[PDB]
Amino acid sequence: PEKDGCGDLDFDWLDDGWLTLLRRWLNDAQRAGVSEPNAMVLATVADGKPVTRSVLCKILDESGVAFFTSYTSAKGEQLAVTPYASATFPWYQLGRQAHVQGPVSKVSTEEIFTYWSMRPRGAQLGAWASQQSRPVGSRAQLDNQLAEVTRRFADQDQIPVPPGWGGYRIAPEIVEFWQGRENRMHNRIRVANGRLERLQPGS
Amino acid sequence: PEKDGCGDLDFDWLDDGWLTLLRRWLNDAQRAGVSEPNAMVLATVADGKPVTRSVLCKILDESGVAFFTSYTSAKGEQLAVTPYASATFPWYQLGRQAHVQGPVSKVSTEEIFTYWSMRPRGAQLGAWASQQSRPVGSRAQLDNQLAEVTRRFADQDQIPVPPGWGGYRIAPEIVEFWQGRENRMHNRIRVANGRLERLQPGS
């Protein structure tokens, strides 16, 4: 009970729909000092087996949750074969989690440009520096990669989008809010087809 | 490079094997005040589609990472059909991640007893109060479930293991260490067939 300082998560918390509540939860985490409050752990499937890693949620609206990545990465390939994902926001400090699962689609060239342009150039370089799946043996080699990319763009103030870099967006088909409680009787609300369902703590 | 106070993770950080490094990283997460240092996001598969939620890693050894849960949860059913998982320790505050993927076996009845007994009275009751199927319409109902189970065991000093309750272990067939860097030239070392491998940041 203590952890988020709040009373029980219940149906009425969803009165303004799933989006308002997620946006509020994401803001409580930001405000409470959580590091990377917008990071989520994304699961995809590779040859029938699940694979997990962390990505940064950059857009949240009625169409779902979006993040940015190289199309050439393993996440990209896996999502190309099996375009469904699940993501979890792990807000342990507050005893909270939210999960989103659904079909994945690419974001617009439009949107890619915008979020690419807000990117601090320290990172713009970094993106370009990552030599998509090129063999690497040392760390020095990584350094050379970033030096080489840095020179190449030194006289450019408007670094362009790499040829295979864009985003993906998970549709909010199933969204679950999880509020933990000291006496293990966790509050679990699942949203699906505009219907709401309360789940037993142990699933 | 800031976030864990450290230089680059490299092959020499693996000299005494993945187990020892995962243990060091878990411990660093503790010393730093990270909430739920041992929690991990577990992905499973449900009819070819990934599914995520957090579990607590309670055993870390040579045979892999283990957590405890009701066999009758969605996660248990999913692991029964497709006994492979991936898990991620999201240490965002230190800019670190560890991933572990592999086949999944049940823990023994021996170890279930041992870890069950280490739970405080509150958590054992909590676990017994989660009634596997039974739909839930109100939150007051969870309360009465905890109150039935409290009264039912009022005279038992030592509460028994619930009938459906046990553990799962992920074998360390792939282990990745991820250490973020301000310049985006993240360090990534994957472990597989005792062979080490540096990966390009952008996967």
Swiss-Prot record, chains A, B:
This protein's assembly is summarised as: Homodimer.
Where does the sequence pass through the membrane? Answer: none
User: Where do the annotations place FMN binding?
Assistant: 53-58, 68-69, 75, 97, 132-133, 178, 188
The record's similarity note reads: Belongs to the pyridoxamine 5'-phosphate oxidase family.
- Look up the record and name the cofactor or cofactors this protein needs: FMN
Q: In which pathway does it act?
A: Cofactor metabolism; pyridoxal 5'-phosphate salvage; pyridoxal 5'-phosphate from pyridoxamine 5'-phosphate: step 1/1; Cofactor metabolism; pyridoxal 5'-phosphate salvage; pyridoxal 5'-phosphate from pyridoxine 5'-phosphate: step 1/1
Give me the residues that bind substrate, please. Answer: 58, 115, 119, 184-186
Instruction: Supply the EC number(s).
Output: 1.4.3.5
Q: What name has this protein been given in UniProt? A: Pyridoxine/pyridoxamine 5'-phosphate oxidase
Q: Which UniProt keywords apply?
A: Flavoprotein, FMN, Oxidoreductase, Pyridoxine biosynthesis
Question: Might you name a Gene Ontology BP term for this protein?
Answer: pyridoxine biosynthetic process
Q: Name one GO molecular function term.
A: pyridoxamine phosphate oxidase activity
Q: Does the keyword tRNA-binding apply?
A: no
- UniProt cofactor note: Binds 1 FMN per subunit.
Lineage summary: Bacteria, Bacillati, Actinomycetota, Actinomycetes, Mycobacteriales
Function of this protein?
Catalyzes the oxidation of either pyridoxine 5'-phosphate (PNP) or pyridoxamine 5'-phosphate (PMP) into pyridoxal 5'-phosphate (PLP).
* Pfam families named in the record: PNP_phzG_C, PNPOx_N
Catalytic activity line of the entry: pyridoxamine 5'-phosphate + O2 + H2O = pyridoxal 5'-phosphate + H2O2 + NH4(+); pyridoxine 5'-phosphate + O2 = pyridoxal 5'-phosphate + H2O2
Q: Could you tell me which InterPro entries the record lists for this protein?
A: Pyridox_Oxase, Pyridox_Oxase_CS, Pyridox_Oxase_N, Pyridoxamine_oxidase_dimer_C, Split_barrel_FMN-bd
Q: Could you tell me the gene encoding this protein?
A: pdxH
Give the organism, scientific name.
Answer: Mycobacterium tuberculosis (strain CDC 1551 / Oshkosh)
